[PDB]
Design a binder for this molecule. Structure first.
Ligand SMILES: Cc1cc(/C=C/C#N)cc(C)c1Nc1ccnc(Nc2ccc(C#N)cc2)n1
Lengths: 408, 546
């Protein structure tokens, strides 16, 4: 009810980010949403004295038919002033993600900072002036919101935590992650118990009823594996030596000397080469090395997480998360990419969101993505398939990696 | 007297850390001073300016031009905050809807009913010099937005919009658009109902004390606006006239391309590649340049396209948008957007991006994304595409390409030249095909090198090379293997560089060597390219680096 003073970082001005083009349906959804928010006092119209801007669009959360406003505060968040992650969350058998972002609207925003939350609802073909608003309350997606609302959330959650001490509750931006070990039916009733426990405080939230269910305990380690074959061709051995050479950047004691000595001569690629005793032993020793963890791998909260993704074909995608090259903190593979059997970009967009979710659960922050896609293609489509209330950072890969072959 | 509603003032600030202007008034002739004194007396009477005391420390120079008054706000403008500028994105005519009637209202006097933020007025101070400098100069400050001041256009437009919003909202059967000192009001209503709407608008504006000329506006359809001609049921660009000349100058060509680019939004098939090529690297505006034979053709082709008027139609929201693309050659692409056959809303073009290697499919994809984004802007939706690429071709491409890629709903249209895939590498080694182990190396100092191969059949070649590099020799080695092999071939290289290029699947390159390789790939039936790491004792695969 009383506002927290908030400031931008030293020597830095507010965001001036262009509104990107919106479809008719998203414009109409935003006009409807903002008209209601304006009546509720959550936002107010602004004048030309405010030159700041942040992009806005609208999405449909997974399994819903109600449009949700999504502000892209990435620039503002970088420019905003700065204000312990639970290692147990990723170990729970079920985690339900709640959208609690609506709660932030109950807290007023510092009068002097509001101008920096300016956004624009554009018109088709710019035929009428864009509708200009700023926030009067903590906005969804702004990093300052969870920080300012934190004392309030803890108070709301106290009785539920007291009565359920083994439940892990973790907040990231507008998301609430609720983890327990258990049977699912009971789990869903704690989540519902939680819900009602929050509704009480409110007295209605459009998306609180929703539950996004995860099972991070089912997530795990994906290591390097070598083929097991009875007949090796020249091509098979060349591929094996290539993979091992690559793996030797990750694992010290990998050797290819004896295997390479099978590749001596100038043989037809499809010709079968019997393994020598020396070559099989080297191969066996390499297998054993690859069963061990990578050495000197640690997470540092002061460094960025980086996520790389490869398209493997047939709807399959591989990814790695690291801070230092060759020191992967997590690797994984997605073989489904549902609903995008004929759409690469939708598949990639879902992969990005899934990887970000894993990252939030494990380290409590989002990675910077290296995306195997041309900038123009991504920028034109990702908002059509986006279903999360946060947005990570990304860059684009224009040169095909050889590494793709090693994660196949 | 009838009470009128005041216009809300916009609070204005100087940029952080900056003070107002303190600029010296230039001397003026006795004649100019008298002119300014009378002008300002009238403005003072009109309430636009007010005399101020000697305490104000700010000043902006004023001039007299042959009289009229000019206040030079360049310094104050530098010191004034940034504003939201709504006009940055202008409507494209192809997105407009047709109208039976469009009326113009003059609102030029309304502009001076906009008051200036009281606290900012002090910064607008100026001084009329006194005759012979024997008395203190007459000091004035503005009470209304000054012409030439940075904030005036944004504040004026926002103030007018705010006034017009309730009228537009309660009268959805009309459209209202402001440009300069005019309001344009369009509708599809019966003329009697439409004229009634205009009088109601005039009555609405009166509430803010804003008067509009009873005498009808002189401007009437067609309208000359932002380089376009707007008619009730069609639009075009203003006349495009290509000059006759015996000699062309950098500047002339820049101006030519500009007109052609402008023309290209409704004249189909405009091309500018060869003319733009003449501008490469050099920017000496007076330097005459001889036209290539290719540039002369391009220009001749464009003159023919422009020989007579072409018009676009307006947008009908009750119908689909269709976008059709053609390949023109040399990285050039052209398109038309229409709802009904033979009636374009607009046209346009796309050019290949600068880069080392490329292929037609990638370019087609890029053009599609450009048109998609343009269409979201203009119409708020994606058009149904008609593309010169077979469905089977597209499927092979995107399923095998290492990047994610997507094209929205589209259909094949069979009009040459068709976009196709010119080669496809094998996924597995070819049984029965000769295996070529290739390599090359060069010396960095003397730039001498070698490229060659050895095969399972005992075939061998080494070629000595001059003026070369490691990367070129690696490509040359692959080229030799392609040249000297049969229709099916397995090729083994250690070149990460060469792998990175072919895996990008180029069909054309800035490297003639790569182009030679592409021409060879096109002639093969089957080609499997295998990579191995260098210097690891692999057979066949380097010593021959000697
Ligand atoms: C953007 C715009 C520029 C001018 C430009 C005014 C000037 N100068 C005039 C108007 C009225 C508008 N606004 C809109 C909005 C929707 N459909 C249209 N269609 C439309 C506009 C003019 C003519 C004509 N003749 C026909 C159809 N105009």
């Amino acid at each position: 009810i009383e506002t927290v003073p908030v400031k931008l970082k030293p020597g830095m001005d507010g965001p001036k980010v262009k509104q990107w083009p919106l479809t008719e349906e998203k414009i109409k959804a935003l006009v409807e949403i903002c008209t209601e928010m304006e009546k509720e006092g959550k936002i107010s119209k602004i004048g030309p004295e405010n030159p700041y801007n942040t992009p806005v669009f609208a999405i449909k959360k997974k399994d819903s038919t109600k449009w949700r406003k999504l502000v892209d505060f990435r620039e503002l968040n970088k420019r905003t002033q700065d204000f312990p992650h639970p290692a147990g969350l990723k170990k729970k058998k079920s985690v339900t993600v709640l959208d609690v972002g609506d709660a932030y609207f109950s807290v007023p925003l510092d009068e002097d900072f509001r101008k920096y939350t300016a956004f624009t609802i554009p018109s088709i073909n710019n035929e009428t002036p864009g509708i200009r608003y700023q926030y009067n309350v903590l906005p969804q997606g702004w990093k300052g919101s969870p920080a300012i609302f934190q004392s309030s959330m803890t108070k709301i959650l106290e009785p539920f935590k007291k009565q359920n001490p083994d439940i892990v509750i973790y907040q990231y931006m507008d998301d609430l992650y609720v983890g327990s070990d258990l049977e699912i039916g009971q789990h869903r009733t704690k989540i519902e118990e939680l819900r009602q426990h929050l509704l009480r405080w409110g007295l209605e939230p459009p998306f609180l009823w929703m539950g996004y269910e995860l099972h991070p305990d089912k997530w795990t380690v994906q290591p390097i594996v070598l083929p097991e074959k009875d007949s090796w061709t020249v091509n098979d051995i060349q591929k094996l030596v290539g993979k091992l050479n690559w793996a030797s950047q990750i694992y010290p004691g990998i050797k290819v000397r004896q295997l390479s000595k099978l590749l001596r001569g100038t043989k037809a690629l499809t010709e079968v080469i019997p393994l020598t005793e020396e070559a099989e032993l080297e191969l066996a020793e390499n297998r054993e090395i690859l069963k061990e963890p990578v050495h000197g791998v640690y997470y540092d909260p002061s460094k960025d997480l980086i996520a790389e993704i490869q398209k493997q074909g047939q709807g399959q995608w591989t990814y790695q998360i690291y801070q230092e090259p060759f020191k992967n903190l997590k690797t994984g593979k997605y073989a489904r990419m549902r609903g995008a059997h004929t759409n690469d970009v939708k598949q990639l967009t879902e992969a990005v969101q899934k990887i970000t979710t894993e990252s939030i659960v494990i380290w409590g922050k989002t990675p910077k993505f290296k995306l195997p896609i041309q900038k123009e293609t991504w920028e034109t489509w990702w908002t059509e398939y986006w279903q999360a209330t946060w947005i990570p950072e990304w860059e684009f890969v224009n040169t095909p990696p050889l590494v793709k072959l090693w994660y196949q | 007297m009838v009470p009128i509603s005041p216009i809300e003032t916009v609070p204005v600030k100087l940029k952080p850390g900056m003070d107002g202007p303190k600029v010296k008034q230039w001397p003026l002739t006795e004649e100019k001073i008298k002119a300014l004194v009378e002008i300002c007396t009238e403005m003072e009477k009109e309430g636009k300016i007010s005399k101020i005391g000697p305490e104000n420390p700010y000043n902006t120079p004023v001039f007299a031009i042959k009289w009229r008054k000019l206040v030079d706000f360049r310094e104050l403008n530098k010191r004034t905050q940034d504003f939201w500028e709504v006009q940055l994105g202008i409507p494209h005519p192809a997105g407009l809807k047709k109208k039976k009637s469009v009326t113009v209202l003059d609102v030029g006097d309304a502009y001076f009913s906009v008051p200036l933020d009281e606290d900012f007025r002090k910064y607008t101070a100026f001084t009329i010099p006194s005759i012979n400098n024997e008395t203190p100069g007459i000091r004035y400050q503005y009470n209304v937005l000054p012409q030439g001041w940075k904030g005036s256009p944004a504040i004026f437009q926002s103030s007018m919009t705010k006034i017009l919003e309730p009228f537009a909202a309660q009268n959805p059967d009309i459209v209202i658009y402001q440009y300069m000192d005019d309001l344009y009001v369009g509708s599809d209503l019966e003329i009697g109902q439409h004229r009634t709407k205009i009088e109601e608008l005039r009555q609405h504006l009166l509430r803010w004390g804003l008067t509009t000329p009873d005498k009808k506006h002189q401007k009437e359809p067609p309208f000359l606006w932002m380089g376009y001609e707007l008619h009730p049921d069609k639009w075009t660009v203003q006349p495009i006239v290509l000059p006759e000349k015996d000699s062309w100058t950098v500047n002339d060509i820049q101006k030519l391309v500009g007109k052609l680019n402008w023309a290209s939004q409704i004249y189909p098939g405009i091309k500018v590649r060869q003319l733009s090529k003449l501008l490469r690297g050099t920017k000496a505006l007076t330097e005459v340049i001889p036209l290539t034979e290719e540039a002369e053709l391009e220009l001749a082709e464009n003159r023919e396209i422009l020989k007579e008027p072409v018009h676009g139609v307006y947008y009908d929201p009750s119908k689909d948008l269709i976008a059709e693309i053609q390949k023109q050659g040399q990285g050039q692409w052209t398109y038309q957007i229409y709802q009904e056959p033979f009636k374009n809303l607009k046209t346009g073009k796309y050019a290949r991006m600068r880069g080392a290697h490329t292929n037609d499919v990638k370019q087609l994809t890029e053009a599609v994304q450009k048109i998609t984004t343009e269409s979201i802007v203009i119409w708020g939706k994606t058009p149904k595409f008609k593309l010169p690429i077979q469905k089977e071709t597209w499927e092979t491409w995107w399923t095998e390409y290492w990047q994610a890629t997507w094209i929205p709903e589209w259909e094949f249209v069979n009009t040459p030249p068709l976009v196709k895939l010119w080669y496809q590498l094998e996924k597995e080694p070819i049984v029965g095909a000769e295996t070529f182990y290739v390599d090359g190396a060069a010396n960095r100092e003397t730039k001498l090198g070698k490229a060659g191969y050895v095969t399972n059949k005992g075939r061998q070649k080494v070629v000595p090379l001059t003026n070369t590099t490691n990367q070129k020799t690696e490509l040359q080695a692959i080229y030799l293997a392609l040249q000297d092999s049969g229709l099916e071939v397995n090729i083994v290289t250690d070149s990460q560089y060469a792998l990175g290029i072919i895996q990008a699947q180029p069909d054309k390159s800035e490297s003639e060597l790569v182009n030679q390789i592409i021409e060879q790939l096109i002639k093969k039936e089957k080609v499997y390219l295998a990579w191995v790491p260098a210097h690891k004792g692999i057979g066949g695969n380097d010593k021959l680096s000697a």
